[PDB]
Write a protein that binds this DNA or RNA. Sequence first.
RNA 1: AAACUGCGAAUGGCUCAUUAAAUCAGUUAUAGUUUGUUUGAUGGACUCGGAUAACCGUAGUAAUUCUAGAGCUAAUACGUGCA
RNA 2: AAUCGCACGGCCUUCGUGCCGGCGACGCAUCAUUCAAAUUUCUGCCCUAUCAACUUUAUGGUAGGAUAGGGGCCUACCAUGGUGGUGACGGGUGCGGAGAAUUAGGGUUCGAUUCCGGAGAGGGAGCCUGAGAAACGGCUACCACAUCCAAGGAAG
Lengths: 200, 98
Amino acid sequence: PLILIIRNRLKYALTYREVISILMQRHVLVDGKVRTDKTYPAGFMDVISIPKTGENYRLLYDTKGRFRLQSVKDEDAKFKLCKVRSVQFGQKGIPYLNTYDGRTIRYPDPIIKANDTIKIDLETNKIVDFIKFDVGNVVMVTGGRNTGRVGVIKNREKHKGSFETIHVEDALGHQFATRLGNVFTIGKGNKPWVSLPKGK
Amino acid sequence: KTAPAVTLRTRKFMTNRLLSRKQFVLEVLHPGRANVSKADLKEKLAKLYEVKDSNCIFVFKFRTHFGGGKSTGFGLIYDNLDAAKKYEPKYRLIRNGL
RNA sequence: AAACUGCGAAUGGCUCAUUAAAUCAGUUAUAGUUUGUUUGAUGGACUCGGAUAACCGUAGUAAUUCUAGAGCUAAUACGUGCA
RNA sequence: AAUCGCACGGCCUUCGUGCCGGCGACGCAUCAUUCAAAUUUCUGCCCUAUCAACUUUAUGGUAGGAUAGGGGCCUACCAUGGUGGUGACGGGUGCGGAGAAUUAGGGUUCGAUUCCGGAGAGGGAGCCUGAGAAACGGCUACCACAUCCAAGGAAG
């Protein structure tokens, strides 16, 4: 949540009961919008954003799994990746494709299953690309001991009830697999998000 | 306060019965032209009864105005049938309980 | 700044009496179902009236607790016309 | 089938007026749903068998009603069942888990104040309100028990 995470960037001394003022000073944005709100939640890939003579930060995970801010380039700040968490199927070809941040999208755009990711800008709420969960694509791992690592998908195993594990080629060192829930896709041949040092 | 010639419309009246209350209602009236009364008021008061010393009535809320027609007034009882009589015993009813 | 309406007073606190139980734990099921508010989604500046508390003026079982006969007054709380 | 709070503009246009317009918070509707819910299942959860046969919508098939949603949850009708020598049904016990203490390890012991889930607010049932309560700081109201009294009635 937004408070905790801005508050995380501070942890030197002297806010928390004073907290309320940072938000009021309207100097914080989430995904390019104004929110001044003390109960607000934020999560992975949200872009968070400071003054004026200022900067931009991306919510990421550290190697253990807690959400933390990382400095982000202005260029990257423009975009966000949204994982398709669920689907209520249908219209025409529309699934209602739920995403991880809690965003709706109804409809085309050419594809789309859970675990695929949508590359979206920010101002318009336009979908630039879809990053498929398939072998050959790169992913970042969202939770656990295994957290905070990236890899290329070697193969996916599907079973009954759910697609159980995703196997990765990789590492600078060796091979590892995780359940699909863990896997967040970040790059394909056509479009990557990956320029962040590395890794087991 | 002071009269020439007027009279009551009893609206409904109501009682707390374990006690010694039934609640007496008018608007005092005179309307059209001119003015607030003794005779009609007294009749209602007296037939309200059978009393002796300083009545069981207390009259004293007349406010009408300088400005406008509505005063109502209406007057007081330990108790009285006429006082039960537009609207017979509630209030002990409200304390029967709900 | 006092009342009305919205959000809240159910969170929280503390005690194991009840308590061997799908009670609880751990794993799943849940399209067999809820989620207001919010974060997020989807829809969308003509004319208006209506009565009401506080304030008031007195009060009954009356010292009472309590609330009403009652003047006065304001509603993104209400009721509407509606592409 | 059935409004606030700041603006500012362009235009016939002096303040005049017509409709619209840049945000910041409304706000209602569930129309897939987010942090933050519930209900169910395959499992295990003390001792006593000088507790050894149990239970009567309590079990099962089918149809309603109910409810946010599952249903003998509630209710008709039909079937007479289902369970237990692998401990059912029943009795006693100076919360359950996360854990605590031991002891080299094994087990024993302990289960609690805290963290977590559940439960109840003198005892018990029911209800309004509100998104959410079956409510310690709401009611109703039988009983239990203190209290006020100008001893009528209130009152916790």
